[PDB]
Design a protein around this ligand. Structure first.
Ligand code: NA
Ligand code: NA
Length: 189
């Protein structure tokens, strides 16, 4: 297996969570959908799945609907459903260790305390897979981590988060146009 076939954006289902930091993965793949104008359908593997085409090939966008900490429960089986492997995966999600307005691309690494990534590592039996970390900043003021990730972005940070979602979409476009992930790392890191 080689070549990107699936982009997973992490987050929690429901209107309550739709603008919270921990749903930044949902937001990016939503943006990627609208700029491919593509359609998300409920899927039996506890996910919303959209499909679009580039040249003659299918690219899938996935929003697990399990809640964050059980994301792998959707992603592992869904990936088996389409016959795809961790090498063909890109996961997009929120990174506390990155400032709002920044993104980082990585090929591997531990969950580092992110329980959605922990679930995907568990269900895939590897921590080697491409990912786009979208900065959500360290917890602001006196908030706990959970209060921080389960709350919206501040007015100050809204233009910065829009910039980093634009950059995340540009990185994905770069991948869809055929550049390698190493190439994308050189360009966006
Ligand atoms: Na949501
Ligand atoms: Na890496």
């Amino acid at each position: 297996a080689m070549g990107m076939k699936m982009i997973v954006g992490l987050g929690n289902p429901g209107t309550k969570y739709q603008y919270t930091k921990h749903n930044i993965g949902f937001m990016v793949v939503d943006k990627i959908a609208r700029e491919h104008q593509a359609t998300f359908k409920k899927n039996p593997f506890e996910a919303e799945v959209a499909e679009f085409f580039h040249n003659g090939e299918k690219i899938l966008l996935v929003k697990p609907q399990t809640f964050m900490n059980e994301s792998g429960r959707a992603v592992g089986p869904l990936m088996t459903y389409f016959g795809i492997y961790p090498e063909e995966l890109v996961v997009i999600y929120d990174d506390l260790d990155l400032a709002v307005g920044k993104i980082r691309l990585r090929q591997k690494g531990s969950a580092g305390g992110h329980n959605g990534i922990k679930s995907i590592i568990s269900h895939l039996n590897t921590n080697v897979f491409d990912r786009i970390k979208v900065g959500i900043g360290r917890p602001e003021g006196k908030k706990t981590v959970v209060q921080h990730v389960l709350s919206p972005f501040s007015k100050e940070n809204q233009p910065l988060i829009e910039e980093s979602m634009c950059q995340s979409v540009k990185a994905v476009e770069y991948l869809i146009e055929g550049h390698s992930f190493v190439d994308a790392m050189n360009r966006f890191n």
